């Protein structure tokens, strides 16, 4: 039996320059190479990519954020490359001390650099968001990717921006470091009386686990019916075939409810966006409204 996890044969044609629609073709690169390695799992073609004003702006910003953090890591390493390599996970770029409040007057070596890098990150991400919206506009597509992306931006905006402002100090924000952002997370829960009692944490965990259940089921199913062309989902929405019927009857005979080809993708987008949506509310309320989730849960509210 053949499972369809990897391809048995790879075929190749001329590079696909892609659909035009209202895209400004002046801003498409040349095609990259073809990857036979990628070709075993998915598509072999790399490129082209679209780079406009927002794309350069976002990419230059994001690099400046990355470099600002890495410059600081080199300073902590005394510019010794062996120290840099050894302690890479232990370096950390922390926010200003609580004393500086929400002020931008903190010295570079004691938080001001964190503010520079956060500013570059702020620009980088919001540019990228506008880019996901405008790439969809040019192709005539719905804005589902931009709105779903907004759900991740919300949790990120809550952690590094909105909650620090409501708390009144930048020190509440997350530091830039491998192990240090892990410590910050652990600390956050202890200080708020165990996040396991935050009902939004609990729902967030449900949607995260649920997202794994769902993609497992959806991907397994489409592979199970790929013998009937199942992965060609748009045409199966326009013109239901036996792949879509058998995928539905699996779900019906197994657990008793119905799933269309389009419908299953609405479950998919919502299961996923709900992770970070509920997550952001749980953080936003921590320390601003609720001091101790254990205490709060004892009055059930």
């Amino acid at each position: 039996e053949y499972q369809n996890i990897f391809s048995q044969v790879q075929v190749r044609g001329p590079a696909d320059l892609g659909m035009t629609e209202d895209v400004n073709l002046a801003n498409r690169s040349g095609v990259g190479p073809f990857s036979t390695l990628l070709g075993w799992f998915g598509n072999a073609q790399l490129g082209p990519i679209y780079l406009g004003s927002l794309g350069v702006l976002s990419l230059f910003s994001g690099l400046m954020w990355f470099f600002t953090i890495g410059i600081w890591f080199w300073y902590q390493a005394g510019w010794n490359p062996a120290v840099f390599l050894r302690d890479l996970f232990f370096f950390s770029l922390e926010p200003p001390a609580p004393e500086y409040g929400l002020s931008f007057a903190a010295p570079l070596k004691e938080g001001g650099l964190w503010l520079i890098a956060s500013f570059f990150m702020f620009v980088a991400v919001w540019s990228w968001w506008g880019r996901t919206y405008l790439r969809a506009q040019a192709l005539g597509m719905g804005k589902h990717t931009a709105w779903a992306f907004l759900s991740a931006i919300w949790l990120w905006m809550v952690l590094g921006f909105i909650r620090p402002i409501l708390m009144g100090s930048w020190s509440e924000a997350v530091p830039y470091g491998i192990f240090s952002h892990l410590d910050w997370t652990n600390n956050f829960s202890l200080v708020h009386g165990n996040l396991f009692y935050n009902p939004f944490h609990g729902l967030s965990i449900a949607f995260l686990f649920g997202s794994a259940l769902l993609f497992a089921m959806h991907g397994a199913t489409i592979l199970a019916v790929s013998r009937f062309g199942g992965e060609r989902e748009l045409e199966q929405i326009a013109d239901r075939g036996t792949a879509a019927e058998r995928a539905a009857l699996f779900v019906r005979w197994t657990m008793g409810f119905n799933a269309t080809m389009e419908g299953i993708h609405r479950w998919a987008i919502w299961m996923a966006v709900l992770v970070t949506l509920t997550g952001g509310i749980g953080i936003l309320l921590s320390g601003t409204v609720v001091d101790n989730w254990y205490v709060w849960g004892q009055n059930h509210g």
Binding site: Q8, V11, R227, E245, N258, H300
Partner: protein, 240 residues
């Protein structure tokens, strides 16, 4: 307090969302029917959604769902019991008749088109610049059935031009005619393609396509349904 208000607000929102989601997944296959085809009395807790309309590209009209459902083909089955809930026996050849795991849906007798209006799937001999770039080229290999007998040889690969993947093997049978075999149901080996689903005598029965340079969405379903159905219906001829 404000956090209890937020968590009540959310549970109500989630109830509405689940409702919206359940009714969105009712846009195909409803209303429910009894096994004789008349509408079932109990159609469930949620109602049907207001219909939506897809504008299909390339001038192929619209689709509105939910909308009138018809199999648009005969179903050669019969009841095996006097009450609801039991299987329906084939009254003929389930593979010839297209029931059970051999089922096909009566889709459009048109080919799927790519974003430019050209046929999505083309045999490689007519797809300019397309070649096998990795893996074993199956073209020229003999095709073996589950009865370990040789039914034909591969004479082409039918490829998805926009997605650049192989979709069908085109097999020539001992009598000079060809059939399509789904890529997802063959095993390409060093010196043969092996087909588990079909025994060698069942290859002539694979449905045939009407023009040799294109395949319609209907023929794709008949071919794929037939080949998959051999897993159940050709088991009296499978060996290890």
């Amino acid at each position: 307090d404000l956090a209890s208000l937020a968590i009540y607000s959310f549970w109500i929102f989630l109830a509405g969302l689940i409702y919206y989601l359940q009714t969105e997944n009712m846009r195909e296959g409803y209303p429910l029917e009894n096994e004789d085809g008349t509408p079932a009395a109990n159609q469930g807790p949620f109602p049907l959604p207001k219909p939506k309309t897809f504008i299909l590209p390339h001038g192929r009209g619209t689709l509105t769902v939910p909308g009138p459902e018809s199999e648009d083909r005969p179903i050669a089955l019969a009841r095996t019991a006097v009450s609801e809930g039991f299987p329906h026996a084939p009254t003929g050849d389930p593979m010839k008749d297209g029931v059970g795991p051999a089922s096909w849906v009566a889709r459009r007798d048109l080919p799927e088109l790519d974003g430019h209006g050209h046929n999505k799937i083309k045999p490689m001999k007519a797809a300019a610049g397309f070649h096998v770039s990795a893996g074993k080229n199956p073209i020229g290999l003999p095709v073996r059935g589950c009865d370990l007998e040789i039914a034909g040889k591969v004479v082409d690969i039918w490829v998805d031009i926009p997605e650049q993947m192989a979709r069908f093997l085109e097999v020539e049978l001992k009598d000079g005619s060809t059939r399509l075999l789904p890529m997802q149901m063959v095993k390409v080996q060093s010196n043969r393609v092996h087909v588990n689903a079909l025994s060698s005598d069942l290859f002539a029965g694979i449905p045939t396509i009407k023009s040799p340079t294109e395949v319609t969405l209907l023929e794709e379903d008949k071919i794929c349904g037939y080949v998959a159905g051999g897993l159940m219906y050709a088991a009296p001829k499978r060996k290890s």
